[PDB]
Design a protein around this ligand. Structure first.
Ligand SMILES: C[C@]12CC[C@H](O)C[C@H]1CC[C@@H]1[C@@H]2CC[C@]2(C)[C@@H](c3ccc(=O)oc3)C[C@H]3O[C@]132
Ligand SMILES: O=c1ccn([C@@H]2O[C@H](COP(=O)(O)OP(=O)(O)O)[C@@H](O)[C@H]2O)c(=O)[nH]1
Length: 427
């Protein structure tokens, strides 16, 4: 059985879908992964997957595709949509001349209009949600008009205004982003399969509520591996020199960027903490680091790298905590790895994830802005996690969640059962 997979063109959307594809390929399915040309330019390793990669045009002007969208999200997301509709149609028409014929298209939930392409081509459509049910519920309420972006929503903790998904940070892209998030639920009744990268035990009540509206399949964590350059050997050799529970892993993901002034705060907090640290600073961001930071002043205790093998880093026993922007993949990967967090959310669902991390799952602490987070606050959070009694509690809580995540993906577990149900439905 031949499955097509079409992620939104960004690493937090590609990666969780890739991991689901790898699990499906392990069960005997053929996989074709559909990527934009801009994504393929960053792809360095794919021979070992056995998954076929088929590219489509970016469909918006070239100058990554994402940094073009941000220039004008309202227009360029719509141009991306129209081009993706045309070019995935053309690609599927071609794939229908080859055996095995495609049967289902799994697409990122942010691209609901791909359902119409799947159905027009005679395929089943599966919408793949890359954020948890608790945060997706807010987008559903946004579509319903129940909330426009203290706040009480069914089966969610009481939220402050600050805990709602942050779109005001995007300035003139705010309304376009709020619309795209809400439109994930615009055709949910017509989707053949609704897949969420979460597991039931993590959010029992909101998953139960969602399931009373639509049949949903919680299949997460989909993560068990890399398409992009991860500097694996350099990172893993450095971590192998570190003793247990001594390393702060620091990463703000694939998209977020911090100001030069904020970078200085983080640099100084890491140095004066006197902890070992592995800090992912993307290539296009390292110019904002203090002058001799990468080459000299970080060499005694730190490794500054443009990308790491994050699953392998979070699995390493030297890692004591994860200073994170709280993107959903990073949050879930840290929880499933038993790694407590220091929450520094930037925008979109990161704000809500940071609330869930700190107050519901209780595996992290959050920083306080002054709107710059200062070194002393970061140092204070580091001391709380690394040294204080509260930090031992967060570590114990993270280990309990690791165990529940292990149950979910093992035989008889909720996510294993749901992937089996999906897999059998196709057979
Ligand atoms: C505006 C922008 C800011 C960061 C950077 O400069 C890029 C900007 C343009 C893209 C934007 C990004 C913010 C986060 C997104 C909305 C995110 C997404 C997409 C679909 C979805 O369902 O959920 C979340 C991933 C990426 O599409 C984002
Ligand atoms: O050095 C890094 C940093 C991040 N990641 C991966 O990149 C994704 C980041 O996704 P997330 O939802 O956390 O945030 P985003 O980048 O979408 O804002 C996750 O799959 C991480 O495992 C990685 O492989 N190496």
């Amino acid at each position: 059985i031949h499955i097509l997979a079409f992620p939104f063109p960004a690493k937090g959307h590609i990666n969780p879908l890739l991991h689901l594809c790898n699990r499906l390929a392990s069960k005997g399915f053929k996989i074709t992964l559909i990527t934009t040309v801009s994504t393929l330019k960053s792809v360095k390793t794919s021979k070992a997957n056995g998954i076929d990669i088929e590219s489509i045009p970016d469909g918006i002007p070239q100058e990554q595709i994402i940094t073009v969208m941000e220039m004008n999200m309202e227009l360029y997301f719509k141009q991306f949509k129209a081009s993706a509709i045309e070019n995935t149609t053309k690609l599927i028409q071609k794939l229908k001349t080859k055996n095995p014929l495609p049967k289902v298209l799994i697409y990122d939930s942010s691209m609901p209009w791909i359902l119409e392409v799947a159905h027009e081509q005679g395929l089943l459509g599966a919408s793949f949600f890359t954020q948890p049910c608790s945060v997706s519920a807010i987008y559903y309420h946004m579509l319903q008009g129940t909330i426009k972006l203290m706040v009480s929503l069914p089966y969610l903790p009481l939220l402050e205004i600050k805990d709602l998904p942050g779109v005001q940070q995007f300035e003139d892209n705010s309304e376009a982003v709020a619309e795209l998030l809400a439109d994930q639920f615009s055709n949910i009744d017509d989707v053949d399969y609704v897949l969420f990268n979460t597991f039931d035990a993590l959010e029992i009540e909101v998953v139960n509520w969602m399931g009373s509206k639509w049949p949903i399949l919680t299949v997460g964590p989909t993560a068990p591996n890399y398409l992009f350059e991860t500097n694996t050997e350099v990172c893993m050799k450095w971590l192998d020199q570190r003793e247990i529970d001594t390393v702060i892993y620091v990463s703000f993901g694939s998209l977020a960027s911090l100001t030069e002034e904020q970078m200085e705060q983080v640099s100084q907090a890491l140095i004066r903490s006197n902890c070992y640290f592995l800090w992912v600073v993307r290539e296009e961001e390292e110019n904002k680091l203090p002058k001799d930071f990468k080459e000299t002043t970080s060499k005694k205790k730190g490794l500054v790298i443009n990308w790491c093998p994050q699953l392998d880093v979070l699995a390493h026993k030297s890692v004591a905590c994860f200073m994170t922007h709280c993107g959903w993949n990073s949050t879930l990967e840290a929880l499933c790895s038993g790694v407590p967090m220091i929450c520094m959310p930037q925008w979109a669902d990161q704000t809500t994830n940071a609330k869930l991390i700190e107050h519901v799952w209780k595996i992290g602490v959050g920083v306080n802005k002054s709107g710059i987070v200062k070194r002393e606050e970061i140092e204070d959070c580091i001391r709380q996690v690394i040294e204080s009694e509260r930090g031992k509690e967060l570590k114990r809580n993270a280990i309990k969640w690791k165990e529940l995540a292990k149950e979910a993906v093992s035989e008889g577990g909720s996510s294993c059962n749901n992937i089996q149900e999906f897999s059998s439905s196709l057979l």
